[PDB]
Design an enzyme around this catalytic site. Sequence first.
Site, PDB file in Angstrom:
ATOM      1  N   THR E   1       0.847  -1.236   0.000  1.00 48.78           N
ATOM      2  CA  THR E   1       0.000   0.000   0.000  1.00 48.78           C
ATOM      3  C   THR E   1       0.865   1.262   0.000  1.00 48.78           C
ATOM      4  OG1 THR E   1      -1.874  -1.087   1.093  1.00 48.78           O
ATOM      5  CG2 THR E   1      -1.803   1.306   1.256  1.00 48.78           C
ATOM      6  N   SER E   2       0.426   2.262  -0.760  1.00 48.40           N
ATOM      7  CA  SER E   2       1.043   3.581  -0.783  1.00 48.40           C
ATOM      8  C   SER E   2      -0.067   4.610  -0.717  1.00 48.40           C
ATOM      9  CB  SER E   2       1.850   3.787  -2.062  1.00 48.40           C
ATOM     10  OG  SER E   2       2.871   2.823  -2.170  1.00 48.40           O
ATOM     11  N   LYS E  33      -8.966   2.710  -1.932  1.00 46.91           N
ATOM     12  CA  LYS E  33      -8.448   2.906  -0.578  1.00 46.91           C
ATOM     13  C   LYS E  33      -8.773   4.289  -0.014  1.00 46.91           C
ATOM     14  CE  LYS E  33      -4.624  -0.187  -1.673  1.00 46.91           C
ATOM     15  NZ  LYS E  33      -3.197  -0.495  -1.393  1.00 46.91           N
ATOM     16  N   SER E 129       3.250   0.499   3.196  1.00 49.81           N
ATOM     17  CA  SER E 129       4.539  -0.156   2.929  1.00 49.81           C
ATOM     18  C   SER E 129       5.412   0.594   1.924  1.00 49.81           C
ATOM     19  CB  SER E 129       4.301  -1.578   2.419  1.00 49.81           C
ATOM     20  OG  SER E 129       3.486  -1.574   1.258  1.00 49.81           O
ATOM     21  N   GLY E 130       4.782   1.148   0.890  1.00 44.59           N
ATOM     22  CA  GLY E 130       5.483   1.905  -0.142  1.00 44.59           C
ATOM     23  C   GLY E 130       5.896   3.322   0.221  1.00 44.59           C
TER      24      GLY E 130
END
Lengths: 244, 226, 204, 250, 196, 243, 231, 241
Positions: E1-2, E33, E129-130
Amino acid sequence: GSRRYDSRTTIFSPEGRLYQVEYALESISHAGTAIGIMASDGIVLAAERKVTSTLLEQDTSTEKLYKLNDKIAVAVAGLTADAEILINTARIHAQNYLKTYNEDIPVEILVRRLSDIKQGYTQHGGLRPFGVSFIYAGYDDRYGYQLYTSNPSGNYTGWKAISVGANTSAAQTLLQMDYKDDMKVDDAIELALKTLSKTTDSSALTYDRLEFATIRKGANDGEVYQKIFKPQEIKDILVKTGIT
Amino acid sequence: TTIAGLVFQDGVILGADTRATNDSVVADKSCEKIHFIAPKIYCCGAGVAADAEAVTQLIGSNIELHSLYTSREPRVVSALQMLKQHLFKYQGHIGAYLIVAGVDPTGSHLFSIHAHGSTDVGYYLSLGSGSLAAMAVLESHWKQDLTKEEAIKLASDAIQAGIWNDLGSGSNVDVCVMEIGKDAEYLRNYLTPNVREEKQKSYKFPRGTTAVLKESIVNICDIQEE
Amino acid sequence: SDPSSINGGIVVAMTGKDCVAIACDLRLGSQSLGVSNKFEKIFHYGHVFLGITGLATDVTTLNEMFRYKTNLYKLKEERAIEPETFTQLVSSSLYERRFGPYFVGPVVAGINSKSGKPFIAGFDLIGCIDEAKDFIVSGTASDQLFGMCESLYEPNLEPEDLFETISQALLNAADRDALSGWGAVVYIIKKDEVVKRYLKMRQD
Amino acid sequence: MTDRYSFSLTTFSPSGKLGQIDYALTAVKQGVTSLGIKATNGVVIATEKKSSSPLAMSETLSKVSLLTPDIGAVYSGMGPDYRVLVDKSRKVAHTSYKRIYGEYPPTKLLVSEVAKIMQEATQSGGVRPFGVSLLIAGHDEFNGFSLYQVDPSGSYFPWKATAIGKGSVAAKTFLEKRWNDELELEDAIHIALLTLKESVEGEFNGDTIELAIIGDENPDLLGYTGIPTDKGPRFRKLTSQEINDRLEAL
Amino acid sequence: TSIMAVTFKDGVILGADSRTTTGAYIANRVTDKLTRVHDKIWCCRSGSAADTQAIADIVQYHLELYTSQYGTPSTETAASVFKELCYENKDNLTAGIIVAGYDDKNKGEVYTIPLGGSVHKLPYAIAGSGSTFIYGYCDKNFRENMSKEETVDFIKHSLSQAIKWDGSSGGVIRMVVLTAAGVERLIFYPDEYEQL
Amino acid sequence: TGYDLSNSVFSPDGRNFQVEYAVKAVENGTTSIGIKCNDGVVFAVEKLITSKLLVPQKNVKIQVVDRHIGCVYSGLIPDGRHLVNRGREEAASFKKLYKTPIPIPAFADRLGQYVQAHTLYNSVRPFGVSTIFGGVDKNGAHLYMLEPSGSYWGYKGAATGKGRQSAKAELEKLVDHHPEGLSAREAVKQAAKIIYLAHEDNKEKDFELEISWCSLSETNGLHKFVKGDLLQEAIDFAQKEIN
Amino acid sequence: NNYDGDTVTFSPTGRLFQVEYALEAIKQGSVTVGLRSNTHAVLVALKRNADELSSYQKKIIKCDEHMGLSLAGLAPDARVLSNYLRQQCNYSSLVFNRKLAVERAGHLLCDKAQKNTQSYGGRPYGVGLLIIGYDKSGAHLLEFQPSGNVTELYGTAIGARSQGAKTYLERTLDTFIKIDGNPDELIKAGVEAISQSLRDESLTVDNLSIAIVGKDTPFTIYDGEAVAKYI
Amino acid sequence: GYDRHITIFSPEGRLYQVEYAFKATNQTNINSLAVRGKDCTVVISQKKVPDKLLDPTTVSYIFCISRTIGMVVNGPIPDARNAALRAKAEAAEFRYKYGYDMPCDVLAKRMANLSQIYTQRAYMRPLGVILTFVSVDEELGPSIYKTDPAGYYVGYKATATGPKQQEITTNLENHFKKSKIDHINEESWEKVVEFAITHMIDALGTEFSKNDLEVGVATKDKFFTLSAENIEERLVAIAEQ
Ligand SMILES: *C[C@@](C)(O)[C@](*)(O)[C@H](CCC1CCCCC1)NC(=O)[C@H](Cc1ccc(OC)cc1)NC(=O)[C@H](C)NC(=O)CN1CCOCC1
Ligand SMILES: [Cl-]
Ligand SMILES: [Mg+2]
Ligand SMILES: [Mg+2]
Ligand SMILES: [Mg+2]
Ligand SMILES: [Mg+2]
């Protein structure tokens, strides 16, 4: 607060009587008569329906005679709805006993349990008692054929022949007159119907008015059969005994 | 399990295989994975077999009572919301993976639900051990404004991909078509590509082959009466 | 340690032409020790037959439970429960213990008294129903029974043929399992007669 | 902020009467007439849509309610009490039966559960009885067609035909003359419409009458196809047009 | 995810990728998202999808009930409800939420709520995470009071790099613009952002 | 009859007589007032000096809720304290969940619903107070008055207790003579005057004046008590107006 | 009349009769006096006996090292309320390392008494309390009534014939407030005050009960030959 | 005669506490009216601010329950607000559990079932209020559903509530007898509000200023109340034709 509106259902009168029990018994005295007669080879349960209408579907109807298990039945006198609450409890108690001991519940134990439930409503909880009197007809291998009655007080007693509901005074005098200890089921059937035929408030006793049942140890090969009589079968036994 | 769902012109379609497994042996060759929630809402199930069955029946029961209470056709979002909230509560311990699809007054809908209570919205979805085989087909062939005839073909193809290439999946293909302004058509055994071939021999034994110690009649009736 | 294979045992059921058959072995053990050679695993509630394999305390407990429930059913409904309905009752009752399950492998067998249709079903320990046309297997030799049934079985067998097929399926499967055998019972069920047969088998 | 009414509000009077049940029955007597007739191949239940205002949309108020696909109910007495009983009846059909056995309860057992709820309001702490009498018509595979009446006491009785509420005494006499055991469903509907006309004052049409049947299976009303065993609901509420058609042949 | 949210002159913009993964399998390549808890209060979700959805659904319920009684809630108020759920259930939740909203009084505001359930009000925020791969880039390139077009480019370039390096991120770049003018949805496809 | 013996019983009128009896306890109590000004509110109360033995300035009647809301009441003083204690719990839980301090209309309904709940059951008694309360929130100044029934409205000026008619008449003049509004410092002076004028109804015993105020400019939107020179200035103004 | 059966019922004039009947139990109780200066605070209590064989009922209860009360009315209710005060004083010490303010102690008693006046089943407390204490803002005297009303005072009295002692204190106000750094003279003024409420009986050695708290004086109770000095 | 104090049956089969709760309904002396357009549902109510010390902006009996649903109350304000807070809570809880906005008729049913409980359970009194719920439902279109202390509810083509409800009711009845349709055939809600005000003026026989009325309007996807100036614009248009 709320105290203002409490009838106080579980108190003694100055004379040492339970008001609500006495008044419940008064209610039961107006209900259709139920008779139980115990013979050497079986038990008879006879009972009079209250609501004669030509449009009542009789063959699917059940207000008086209920099955508790394969060995024990009851005749009801009083509020039917109240009786059904108790009947379903008794049905459960019998299956709890069967599950625990792997033996059919003895008749007195089932009776005592129901009678203890009724007692509780007279001593605690502030609720009205059950307006119901039962005649228990049953069999077990200890005492054989047994008849009991319980009333809203939770008191129970054993009988050779007994009536509950309407005209019990008159009904008990007639049973006490014609009952004998060596009597048989066929004779007891005739006694039950004759007693109802005389005590009834109706003009004549007919098939559409009756619920009838027998518990016999006269099944194939020494077993016990509960027979709840169909309408046509009640009509036949009325002709046989010579009432219609 | 290979379950899938995809949308087409004026509807949504669901597909499923008919295999159930216990360890590495087949427990059922003809099991119904496409489940009834409402007359026009259906649910594909995967994962723990009792769980996916029980959770759809429970929500289906509550959807019926809700529909009676409100005097309305149930919506797919209601089934979705009820399923996810139930599954979330149990933290994945009810191991049910579901594709929910249907038609209601809002339109046609297609959702997936995972055991931990996450939901997705999609035009084509697949779940179970055969999802990758199915998704490969759906990614290759799915387009916008599919006809019903193309959609049934694509859905059945996606399930077939799972049947052949996934050991978890097998036997037959069940389909359910939910189109706008029409009765949902449930098509059990839509394909039957895995009929067992005729056996070489008959193993019917000569009578008396088995050695017997005792015989008796069982009394199954109530009361033998006088 | 594994509750489903402490005591051992097996049940198999099959459909035939206007009939069903259900059969079970008679062993009860404590792992390697054979304890009882009279532990029957098939019970009946009216005309519906239930076989149960798995942990023996749960076999006995569930028998007592379904006797209880079908007795109350009969008193209220004023008729004997049918196989299809009983199957749903078994499933419900197992699934309510989802997270503390009975370690059992039940098998329902019977003929619907109204439609006359033969019926069999099987369940996992948490109530997932397998409603097979052909056959159902359960127990510690379920793999062995699957193999026997899948080759020996043909549809529409007459009662006396179906007896031979189910008996040979049970006997040969049991002989390849350490924790099954020690005797066996076969019920042949028709619409209004049920024959029960004890089989001669090897006692090791 | 306490519920201190843990005691019975319905008690036995010196004469043996349960006052609150009798008074509940009096409330039922004041209520609008409803009736039920059983045929060989069906059951019919009917009542008058007594509209409280002409601005009110009487279609939104359903006096005749589906309980299960094969069981329907109608009442006489207090409407709000009926509405909550229908909610509980529908729910108990699922919780105490369908979620256990995987099928809908037979008519008599659903009735028994409703009866039980009404009995408890006659004995539990801090509550009055329900001020309704119900007529419950239904079908199930092993009992066939049936019609039951349920009273505020919790008592229930099976009927071939009956009526409750305002003009029940006259209506029950009318039904006694007309009812026989060879009636078809159409004959029973015709008799239901004749019986109900006597107790209605004002307009008598499909818009002021509510009538439903328990009859043949309706696969057209099911909503789906593909399961041979599920053949559709036996309960059907007759439309405003369907009632008016039968009023021309009256 | 970013995921990221960036305040600018006219209000605030939320940005996210569209990839959801179960290990290395992309379970959903077109995920949304950016999720609405109120008309002009949105959030970006990272962590367990089940948890963040469950939280977001509860917050939407709380703010709907707040609105019925007390009128439009502030962005600070929305962030506080998110915090309360995250902090009190920190032992059972894996949720990293960025809350972004537009008032007329406060203009654009961004609150970040990491794993612990702490709250941090910031000019912009990045998460998922990104995000690790773009701390350097975002710090060097962020300015306060950017225009709408500049902020769209800043997010597009940022998430493009996050997507490029993080396997867990990918798909389309979704954005949601929150100003006085209203609510605008933007989408940017791979063929556009990859060549930046 | 008997309809007035139990709380929550409707009379044939459609009235709850127990609530109307609680109002009599309120009418029996000392005078308290509230004045809405330009950027805030002012609260004032009559404190009867029963004896010389009462310590001056010590028996404080006005109560703060959170930091921005003032509460004053007439009637059964303990019932007022019980209501403020609840108000403090309501304001705390609001701030805990939503971060921002409780808005005044929001706070008003919290008290309103709680008081109304004490007219729903016979197991509880209605509140024997009318409560005047208010303060400054994000939307500006708000003054409320809350009755034993749970009824409340917003006010320009409010008054309750034994001197309410006198006070209400004085407040009505201020509303007419100042449509553009009243300043905070003016409202303090006027509050002192109105309590002094309303004291003619309780004229037997001498009294002690107590004033509080929330104002955006004069207190930063926080509740504070008027003390020292500003209190004495208001007393002097009030003493001058009666003579 | 009809509106005095329970505490939950207002009368038509807005009165709570059960509370007023509880208030009456205090008037039947034996007299007790409270007074203070800037440095010290004193309780004086006339204890009551059942007969000549009996002991004299204790009137004064210690709540903390810096706080205590005297009672008049139902003694078991004073025990319940003093125990509650002990706990609240104790909670303040254990959790905050803080001696409970006398004003805050009054507020807690008020709210405890109030709950019993608004809810069904319960009854009001049947006792009045005079709380003395020395805290961070000096000497304090409180009067508690079981209606909930608590009042901070320079001096007061409660119980039977308390109006005599209360008038004396109202005259003496300017004198006894100035008795700073002299505990014996402040007790003398309290003993002289309680003497105005006596009829027939006089202050004997086992009749009188005195308590004092102050600047460098913990709450201590004097009974028996310890009060012979002041007779 | 304790059968008149709590909710138990009198010998006549009546609940006197329910009947007396209906009488509390008219304690405010306010009349309300609700009508349906093509695309809208309009509710109007009299507004009376007797005290000059009152803040007139806070005096209201119209409540925004949800975005789509509005509710006007006839009865005392404490019970009105009790009912308002509960309906708001129920509407929000519904949306959370079932994933769509609570319909007007379903909320009405829910509140009516809650009212029914107070008529059956002794410890809870009935609320002395009549609740009129209004919306433009996404399935049923313009909707008016009304609840009372008995627990009765029903849908309405139009309705009126208060002391002078019968006068308003007959006025509306006569209009719909002419038009022969279930609604006000009008495109804009502004003209439906003008109809509502006009037919209240005709029915009650009183003129209105901007401060004498209170208006609520339901459209697709929102319910809102009109300001005094919005009403003034409405009153000007009525006078000009
Ligand atoms: C087999 C496949 C391809 O995985 C499918 O997912 C299939 C779905 C069947 C289901 C669909 C909805 C309608 C009802 C039928 N699932 C199974 O066959 C399932 C596979 C499985 C097994 C174990 C497991 O553990 C986490 C997950 C998924 N099989 C079963 O559930 C079988 C019938 N039972 C068991 O394996 C025993 N259970 C013991 C208790 O824990 C759960 C498994
Ligand atoms: Cl409800
Ligand atoms: Mg072996
Ligand atoms: Mg061996
Ligand atoms: Mg990538
Ligand atoms: Mg009540």
